[PDB]
Design a protein around this ligand. Structure first.
Ligand SMILES: Cc1noc(N)c1-c1ccccc1
Length: 125
């Protein structure tokens, strides 16, 4: 089954913004999570062809991944931290929707989500 086009990482109709919190989400939150041993499945859009998940995009209609989020942050695509946080949460939720409790990929998402929540608990002012 085909992959859809990946989510946009720029949008000229959308206003950009740089905030201390968005800087921090890239420099600290994203870039540290990225180095985690369980980060690799989330560093690019789900390749449903390669992974032999032909029903992935029949189920997941708002795909998200850290590769896309990283590019969005580097673009200053977001208006605020909450928009970016929402993308992280979409990424985790997608994983829990498509997969089942106890699955290896779910254990990976669960661990990353905990680390993510740990790091966004306190943001710059
Ligand atoms: C990401 C993701 N979301 O659902 C999966 N099965 C995966 C995945 C699982 C194993 C390797 C790579 C990706």
């Amino acid at each position: 089954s085909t992959n859809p086009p990946p989510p946009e990482t720029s949008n000229p109709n959308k206003p950009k913004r740089q905030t201390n919190q968005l800087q921090y989400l890239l420099r600290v939150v994203l870039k540290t999570l990225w180095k985690h041993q369980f980060a690799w499945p989330f560093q690019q859009p789900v390749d449903a062809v390669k992974l032999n998940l032909p029903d992935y995009y029949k189920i997941i209609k708002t795909p998200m991944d850290m590769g896309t989020i990283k590019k969005r942050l580097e673009n200053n695509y977001y208006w605020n931290a909450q928009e970016c946080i929402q993308d992280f949460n979409t990424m985790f939720t997608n994983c829990y929707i498509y997969n089942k409790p106890g699955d290896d990929i779910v254990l990976m998402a669960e661990a990353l989500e905990k680390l993510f929540l740990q790091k966004i608990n306190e943001l710059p002012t």
